[PDB]
Tab-separated table of C-alpha atoms (C1' of nucleotides) in Angstrom:
chain	number	residue	atom	x	y	z
A	1	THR	CA	53.626	113.618	71.140
A	2	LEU	CA	54.955	111.142	74.746
A	3	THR	CA	54.665	114.678	76.634
A	4	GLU	CA	51.557	116.755	77.123
A	5	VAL	CA	50.910	120.402	78.051
A	6	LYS	CA	48.485	120.352	80.414
A	7	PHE	CA	46.819	123.501	81.234
A	8	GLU	CA	45.914	125.287	84.415
A	9	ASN	CA	44.844	128.408	84.829
A	10	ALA	CA	44.809	132.045	88.087
A	11	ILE	CA	41.426	133.386	88.908
A	12	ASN	CA	42.496	136.443	91.500
A	13	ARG	CA	38.794	136.985	93.540
A	14	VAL	CA	40.037	140.954	93.348
A	15	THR	CA	38.400	140.629	89.308
A	16	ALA	CA	38.328	137.483	88.831
A	17	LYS	CA	40.137	137.199	86.265
A	18	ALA	CA	41.820	134.147	83.955
A	19	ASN	CA	45.233	134.339	83.742
A	20	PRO	CA	46.136	130.871	82.025
A	21	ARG	CA	49.253	128.587	83.264
A	22	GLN	CA	50.861	125.221	81.621
A	23	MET	CA	52.354	122.275	82.946
A	24	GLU	CA	53.543	119.727	80.577
A	25	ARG	CA	54.068	116.546	82.213
A	26	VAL	CA	55.239	112.811	81.709
A	27	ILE	CA	52.825	109.987	79.899
A	28	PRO	CA	51.291	108.723	83.014
A	29	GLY	CA	51.735	105.421	81.831
A	30	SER	CA	55.600	105.775	80.811
A	31	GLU	CA	57.787	103.310	82.751
A	32	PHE	CA	61.558	103.320	83.922
A	33	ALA	CA	63.630	101.451	84.283
A	34	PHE	CA	65.052	101.434	87.934
A	35	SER	CA	68.422	100.415	89.255
A	36	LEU	CA	70.733	101.229	92.689
A	37	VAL	CA	73.372	99.011	94.160
A	38	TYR	CA	74.046	98.251	97.960
A	39	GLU	CA	77.833	97.018	98.800
A	40	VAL	CA	79.127	95.173	101.645
A	41	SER	CA	79.833	98.600	102.531
A	42	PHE	CA	83.595	98.096	104.110
A	43	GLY	CA	84.365	101.229	106.133
A	44	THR	CA	86.637	104.379	105.513
A	45	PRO	CA	85.971	105.976	109.139
A	46	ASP	CA	87.488	108.733	110.300
A	47	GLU	CA	86.102	107.802	113.146
A	48	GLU	CA	89.056	105.492	115.548
A	49	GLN	CA	86.520	102.201	114.504
A	50	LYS	CA	89.114	100.826	111.426
A	51	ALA	CA	87.839	98.085	109.745
A	52	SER	CA	84.572	98.004	110.316
A	53	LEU	CA	82.830	95.753	108.037
A	54	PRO	CA	79.360	95.722	107.980
A	55	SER	CA	78.281	92.016	108.386
A	56	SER	CA	74.293	90.905	107.424
A	57	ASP	CA	72.398	91.761	110.179
A	58	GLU	CA	73.338	95.905	109.602
A	59	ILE	CA	72.561	95.059	105.652
A	60	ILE	CA	69.089	93.897	106.367
A	61	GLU	CA	68.591	96.919	108.422
A	62	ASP	CA	68.552	99.034	105.147
A	63	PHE	CA	66.072	97.220	103.172
A	64	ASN	CA	63.871	98.570	105.832
A	65	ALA	CA	65.584	102.162	105.292
A	66	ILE	CA	65.309	100.475	101.552
A	67	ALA	CA	61.453	99.138	102.166
A	68	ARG	CA	60.299	102.519	103.742
A	69	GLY	CA	62.566	104.503	101.442
A	70	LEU	CA	60.495	104.477	98.559
A	71	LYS	CA	56.941	102.771	100.432
A	72	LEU	CA	56.174	106.733	101.733
A	73	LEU	CA	57.541	107.844	97.604
A	74	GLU	CA	55.248	105.891	96.460
A	75	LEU	CA	52.444	107.657	98.277
A	76	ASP	CA	54.331	111.002	97.953
A	77	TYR	CA	55.274	112.675	94.968
A	78	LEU	CA	59.177	112.598	93.073
A	79	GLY	CA	57.671	116.393	90.807
A	80	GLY	CA	57.406	119.591	90.795
A	81	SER	CA	53.465	121.725	91.268
A	82	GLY	CA	53.575	120.938	95.022
A	83	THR	CA	50.897	118.972	96.615
A	84	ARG	CA	48.875	119.091	93.178
A	85	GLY	CA	48.311	115.942	92.346
A	86	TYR	CA	51.221	115.014	90.326
A	87	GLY	CA	53.714	112.416	90.618
A	88	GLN	CA	52.233	109.655	92.291
A	89	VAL	CA	54.166	106.313	91.285
A	90	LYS	CA	54.121	103.058	92.130
A	91	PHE	CA	57.389	101.545	91.781
A	92	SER	CA	56.838	98.079	89.878
A	93	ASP	CA	58.921	94.549	89.961
A	94	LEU	CA	61.948	95.372	93.028
A	95	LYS	CA	64.046	92.692	93.221
A	96	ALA	CA	67.817	92.958	94.729
A	97	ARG	CA	69.927	90.781	92.978
A	98	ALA	CA	74.594	89.586	94.116
A	99	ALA	CA	76.344	91.273	91.301
A	100	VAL	CA	79.439	90.679	91.965
A	101	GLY	CA	80.239	89.591	95.942
A	102	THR	CA	80.458	86.680	98.024
A	103	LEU	CA	77.111	86.901	99.426
A	104	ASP	CA	75.428	83.857	100.935
A	105	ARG	CA	72.473	81.505	99.440
A	106	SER	CA	70.169	82.762	102.842
A	107	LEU	CA	70.342	86.429	103.185
A	108	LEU	CA	69.715	87.671	99.433
A	109	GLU	CA	66.087	86.777	99.653
A	110	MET	CA	65.679	87.565	103.024
A	111	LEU	CA	66.016	90.934	101.626
A	112	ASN	CA	63.618	91.076	98.684
A	113	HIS	CA	61.798	90.279	102.090
A	114	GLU	CA	61.885	93.804	102.388
A	115	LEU	CA	61.718	94.813	98.748
A	116	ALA	CA	56.950	93.535	99.175
A	117	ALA	CA	56.709	95.629	101.818
A	118	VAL	CA	56.183	98.431	100.157
B	1	A	C1'	188.153	146.737	67.949
B	2	C	C1'	182.437	144.134	74.773
B	3	G	C1'	183.585	136.010	75.879
B	4	G	C1'	181.514	139.462	71.172
B	5	A	C1'	178.814	138.580	66.556
B	6	A	C1'	173.798	135.025	64.844
B	7	A	C1'	169.341	132.136	67.248
B	8	C	C1'	161.691	130.316	68.221
B	9	U	C1'	161.899	127.230	74.567
B	10	U	C1'	159.072	125.241	69.307
B	11	A	C1'	156.823	120.982	66.747
B	12	A	C1'	151.445	118.315	67.089
B	13	A	C1'	147.160	115.860	70.975
B	14	A	C1'	139.439	117.152	71.893
B	15	C	C1'	138.390	116.883	79.277
B	16	C	C1'	136.509	113.384	76.462
B	17	G	C1'	133.940	108.066	76.588
B	18	U	C1'	128.636	105.246	79.685
B	19	G	C1'	123.459	107.581	82.067
B	20	U	C1'	115.900	109.267	80.975
B	21	U	C1'	113.955	114.454	86.174
B	22	G	C1'	111.838	108.394	86.915
B	23	C	C1'	108.585	105.576	90.395
B	24	A	C1'	103.782	104.921	93.703
B	25	C	C1'	98.674	109.146	94.127
B	26	U	C1'	90.281	109.309	91.571
B	27	G	C1'	89.687	116.266	91.372
B	28	C	C1'	86.617	112.918	95.668
B	29	A	C1'	82.295	113.370	99.253
B	30	A	C1'	76.959	116.045	100.757
B	31	C	C1'	72.867	118.542	98.447
B	32	C	C1'	64.782	117.384	95.693
B	33	C	C1'	64.757	122.645	89.998
B	34	G	C1'	61.336	122.737	94.762
B	35	G	C1'	57.409	125.877	96.887
B	36	A	C1'	51.439	129.260	96.955
B	37	A	C1'	46.808	130.339	90.805
B	38	U	C1'	39.451	126.943	88.659
B	39	U	C1'	40.017	126.822	82.307
B	40	C	C1'	37.601	130.628	83.847
B	41	U	C1'	32.184	134.475	84.612
B	42	U	C1'	27.343	137.002	80.220
B	43	G	C1'	24.240	132.671	77.056
B	44	C	C1'	16.657	129.616	76.385
B	45	A	C1'	16.960	125.640	69.549
B	46	C	C1'	14.228	129.178	68.234
B	47	G	C1'	11.121	133.156	65.837
B	48	U	C1'	7.719	131.599	61.152
B	49	C	C1'	1.429	129.052	59.821
B	50	G	C1'	-3.783	132.500	53.755
RNA sequence: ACGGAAACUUAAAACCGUGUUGCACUGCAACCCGGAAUUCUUGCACGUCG
């Protein structure tokens, strides 16, 4: 059926009366693909620092921000019905890939080193 | 029988022919459909044997 009807209940301690609730979730094995693109991020600045191209050292900071972005996200939620247990996810098979660009060989394999640190 | 009396300033001819209101321009940048609710409280596998 691809989507459960997971129930719930309310109990008010004035009278212990039952009030139901239904929280339809995803199936807990539903795997999704997951893509995102980074870039060499060449600045279009309002600020006076005109044509400030990020080099690899500014790039390699961001993969830790990719790491600690999703490392806590695996630990934390995604969805609603907050703080009752829904949405423990596990990001798997993370890989960066120079789709288009002139990235050097040494860099990209070290950019995946942050991706396994989660 | 007045230097008198008669007479068109008249006939035709195109202000026409060549010519783009055209070329450069992201309806774009930022935001979680997110927060708090017990599937619960009453309930014995048993009456029945000349």
